[PDB]
């Protein structure tokens, strides 16, 4: 066994360098050349809040078993991840580093690293994927506390202590650092925003939400406090080993790349646990645009498995957003259902109400919902109110003044305001008006395979051609493109 | 006186349609004095029975060269739509109108008492005069081009009857200035303002909205009242110091009183079951502007007044006058400080940090500096400015940094033409350091000949470019602490 600084990086990395004048982005979908230039223990900026920096961290904490899973990872990046953990973490807290080699072409990549202090290497003899691999590694883990990391991460100053502090106090807490950004092209370590929560849209795709000004303001008191998050990114978190096992580990039937973060996030919250982002904890991660290793299927499959088990009726809203997904077979979900029963978990409705209330949820009787799309353009109130005109604006999925509903009352409403046919004459501007169910002028029907909006009891169609000349108009229905409108969710 | 329906409107109204009033007079004149209008109320209000032991009100209506048809129509709407026993009197304050007959003639009408001003006093002074003359326990103020709706008054009176410190407003429906159509307003609105102290309508937060879903016609707390149209306990009005008597003609009215009420232990409400139509217009039939506004700001706002001046620097120059009594008044009343107001009443108002050098939007012509919803390691750009300040909300810090939230404009690469990036703010990062130059019209990267430049916006995003006379290098913050 060898101490990390005595490890010969030049020799390790050198075998596998980018050659000739070949493409440095080819193997990994990040700049390998730039990564390889980097010292195994390279210096990085302290991206922490000042308050964290002025803090004595307890060290009387349970040790962790770091689980790192990988498949044909760039040697320099992999090594760097491992050394960052060793160098930046109080040793007594680092029980072991468990390297799970997920059927890498070259077994030496991982095997060689096995020489290193506290590094244990586990090699899959077939491709299992991220979820299954993690479980294997977790299973092999000796410590009380589990830490999961990606294979192209860089740990920052006193990254571990704050995380451990949390789960030590309360073993149902599942915690994450703030995930700094490591640039995929030049490998610059960039400090991320701390003002972010995890989140999602009805298509169940992960996204970063900004905190509400309400929330932000209420923290001003303590700005480095834990942040409740309805969802975790997934790559990087810390979890009590026993708790992990108890709650049902990971869904074992999921595949290569999910999806898993979705499922676990729901499961933890619903079954009495909590999810935290921890600002004083900083870990760099190489974000990329594409995977190096069907994708839309596997994603849909896993996503389905999660939705079907946890979401209850609200699953439909998913299918509304992504109808193609109804067709994707997902498989057997029996144990998972039993698991939920057994754990005495809360229903999804509870989750939405208490955990993710800012998630905009359609009325149960709404016909259609969300944004009203016309190409890359969206239907937009333009910040107008009553007696106000209406328009178009490039779509932005921030759904605010772009948030619309097609009601059971056949009405096209934003907030308590309604698209109103004030004047039946073609070319006539429509108006925003207070919704009245009795009002026939406010009545709209979807036509031509839910691709248009016809004014009920007429040959008139919602039309954007007049947008630049005053606003959305009512025009005689015809095969024009300006009459094309699609809601993002349909039921 | 004479019964309103016996009043001869045809005769009264008898002596370019937009010229005199900045609304369509012809269209207004076509209208019957008691014309029918749609019931714009929530269903729940419709289905509701009212007290009877309610205090009567003294309706105060103030006017200056108002359109006869509109004026009459306001008055008859009050009479026709209000239970008579609740209408003590209608007080018409003629604010030095060219033709005194306009008002005088209306004096024939049941419960109508006309007060003329023998010189132009303005809206604020006139109201006080009227209030002073008022016999009832409760004061009601209205504009001279309003139309009262079904059971408008009872819900207002109900409130101030229960609690005399409540100052209440109806939802103000919209009367179209061109065609005179009565249009139902949004009930999802609160009163508000920006640091330029200009009144504006805020939407309720989804948080708020949701929490009302239980009772959707409940009173709505508002940090600010539109001003034209409200109901107030007469004694309370007097106690709290009426109106500021040295204010003049033009606005600022809503402003001062709104602060005063809240700060001095009272409350402001919008009342959804109460509906009153108002003729909104684009223009008046500019410094008083600043004057009055100043008087309010200087008295109530404490240090935060500076933020106003920052938004409107030209206002520093405008003389406002003597504010002694008003200050004494505030002392006497044992009023809370403005900080309290902001924290407790108007917290959604975005308030700069105390050390911040500049604040708000970063303007380049009609375009604004915008994050494009990008986060860290993200590029940055321009977007047509929208005063909804979100991804257009910026600050120039004491640390010489140009920050949005906890993100910072970062000079990643000093080479001219180089794209800048959004990065987590570090005080010890030199690459993040910016200075204002050329009379606060540009942004120079500290320790360089490099200037923040938008010419590359369409080709990748905002860049760092060699400082020069180009228009793409022009940037102005909406608030400056200078």
């Amino acid at each position: 066994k060898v101490r990390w600084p005595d490890f010969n990086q030049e020799a390790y990395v050198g075998g596998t360098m980018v050659r000739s004048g070949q493409d440095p982005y080819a193997r990994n979908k990040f700049n390998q050349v730039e990564s390889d230039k980097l010292r195994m223990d390279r210096a990085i900026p302290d991206t922490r809040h000042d308050q964290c920096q002025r803090k004595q961290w307890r060290v009387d904490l349970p040790a962790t078993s770091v689980v790192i899973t990988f498949h044909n990872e760039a040697r320099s990046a992999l090594l760097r991840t491992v050394v960052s953990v060793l160098k930046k973490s109080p040793p007594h807290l680092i029980k072991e580093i468990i390297l799970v080699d997920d059927y890498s072409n070259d077994p030496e990549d991982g095997a060689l690293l096995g020489k290193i202090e506290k590094v244990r290497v586990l090699r899959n003899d077939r491709r299992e994927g991220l979820m299954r691999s993690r479980v294997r590694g977790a299973d092999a883990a000796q410590a009380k506390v589990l830490t999961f990391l990606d294979s192209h991460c860089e740990c920052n100053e006193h990254w571990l202590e704050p995380l451990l502090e949390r789960v030590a106090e309360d073993r149902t807490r599942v915690v994450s650092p703030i995930i700094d950004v490591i640039n995929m092209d030049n490998f610059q370590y960039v400090g991320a925003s701390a003002d972010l929560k995890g989140g999602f849209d009805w298509n169940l795709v992960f996204k970063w939400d900004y905190m509400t000004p309400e929330q932000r303001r209420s923290r001003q008191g303590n700005p480095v406090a834990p942040i409740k998050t309805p969802m975790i990114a997934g790559g990087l978190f810390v979890m009590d080993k026993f708790y992990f096992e108890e709650l049902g580990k990971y869904d074992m039937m999921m595949d290569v790349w999910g999806g898993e973060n979705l499922e676990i996030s729901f499961r933890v919250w619903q079954c009495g646990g909590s999810l935290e982002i921890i600002p004083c904890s900083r870990v760099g991660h190489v974000f990329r645009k594409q995977h190096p290793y069907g994708s839309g299927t596997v994603f849909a499959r896993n996503t389905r498995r999660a939705a079907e088990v946890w979401m209850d009726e609200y699953k439909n809203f998913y299918y509304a957003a992504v109808p193609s997904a109804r067709n994707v077979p997902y498989g057997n979900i029996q144990s998972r259902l039993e698991l939920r029963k057994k754990l005495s978990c809360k229903p999804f409705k509870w989750y939405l109400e208490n955990v993710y209330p800012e998630l905009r949820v359609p009325d149960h009787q709404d016909i259609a919902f969300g944004a009203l799309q016309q190409g890359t353009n969206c239907l937009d109130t333009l910040g107008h109110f009553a007696d106000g005109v209406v328009g178009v604006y490039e779509c932005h999925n921030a759904g605010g003044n772009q948030e619309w509903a097609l009601t059971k009352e056949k009405s096209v409403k934003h907030m308590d305001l309604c698209l109103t046919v004030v004047d039946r004459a073609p070319g006539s501007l429509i108006k925003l008006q207070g919704c009245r169910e009795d009002d026939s002028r406010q009545k709209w029907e979807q036509i031509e395979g839910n691709s248009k909006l016809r004014h009920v009891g007429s040959n008139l169609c919602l039309d954007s051609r007049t947008a630049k000349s005053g606003g959305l108009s009512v025009e005689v229905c015809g095969p024009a493109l300006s009459q094309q409108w699609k809601f993002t969710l349909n039921l | 006186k004479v019964r309103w329906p016996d009043f001869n409107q045809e005769a009264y109204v008898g002596g370019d349609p937009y010229a005199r009033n900045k609304f369509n007079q012809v269209e207004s004149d076509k209208l019957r004095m008691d014309r029918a209008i749609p019931d714009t109320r929530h269903d729940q209000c419709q289905r509701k029975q009212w007290r009877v032991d309610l205090p009567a009100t003294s309706v105060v209506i103030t006017f200056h060269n108002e359109a006869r048809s509109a004026l009459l129509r306001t008055v008859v709407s009050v009479l026709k739509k209000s239970p008579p026993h609740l209408i003590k009197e209608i007080i018409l304050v003629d604010d030095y109108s060219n033709d005194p007959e306009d008002g005088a003639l209306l004096g024939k009408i049941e419960k109508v008492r006309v007060l003329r001003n023998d010189r132009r006093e303005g809206l604020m002074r006139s109201r006080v005069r009227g209030a002073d003359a008022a016999q009832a326990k409760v004061l009601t103020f209205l504009d001279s081009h309003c139309e009262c709706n079904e059971h408008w008054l009872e819900p207002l009176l109900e409130r101030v009857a229960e609690d005399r410190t409540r100052v209440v407003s109806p939802i103000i429906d919209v009367i179209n200035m061109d065609n005179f159509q009565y249009v139902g307003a949004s009930a999802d609105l609160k009163g508000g303002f920006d640091w330029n102290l200009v009144f504006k309508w805020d939407y309720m937060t989804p948080e708020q909205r949701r929490s009302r879903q239980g009772n959707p016609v409940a009173p709505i707390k508002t940090p600010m009242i539109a001003g034209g149209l409200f109901v107030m306990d007469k004694f309370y009005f007097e106690e709290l110091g009426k109106y500021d008597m040295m204010m003049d003609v033009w606005g600022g009215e809503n402003l001062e009183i709104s602060f005063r009420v809240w700060q001095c232990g009272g409350s402001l409400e919008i009342i959804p079951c109460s509906r009153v139509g108002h003729v909104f217009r684009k223009q008046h039939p500019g410094t008083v502007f600043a004057r009055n506004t100043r008087r309010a700001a200087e008295v109530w706002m404490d240090e935060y007044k500076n933020f106003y001046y920052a938004a409107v620097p030209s206002a520093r120059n405008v003389p406002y006058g003597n504010i002694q009594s008003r200050l004494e008044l505030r002392k006497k009343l044992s009023c809370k400080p403005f900080k309290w107001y902001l924290e407790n009443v108007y917290p959604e108002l975005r308030v700069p940090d105390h050390q911040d050098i500049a604040f708000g939007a970063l303007q380049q012509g009609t375009n604004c500096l915008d994050t494009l919803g990008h986060f860290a390691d993200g590029v940055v750009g321009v977007y047509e400015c929208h005063n909804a300040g979100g991804n257009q909300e910026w600050a120039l810090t004491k640390e010489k940094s140009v920050k949005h939230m906890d993100l910072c404009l970062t000079v990643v690469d000093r080479a001219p033409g180089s794209l800048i990036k959004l990065q987590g703010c570090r005080e010890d990062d030199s690459r993040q350091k910016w200075e204002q130059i050329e009379g606060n019209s540009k942004l120079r990267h500290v320790g360089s000949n490099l200037c923040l430049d938008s010419r590359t916006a369409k080709s990748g995003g905002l860049s760092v470019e060699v400082c020069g006379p180009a228009l793409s290098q022009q940037w102005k913050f909406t608030l400056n602490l200078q």
Binding site: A192, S193, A233 | -
Partner: peptide
């Protein structure tokens, strides 16, 4: 891919 902070 996961999306960047």
């Amino acid at each position: 891919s996961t999306c960047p902070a």
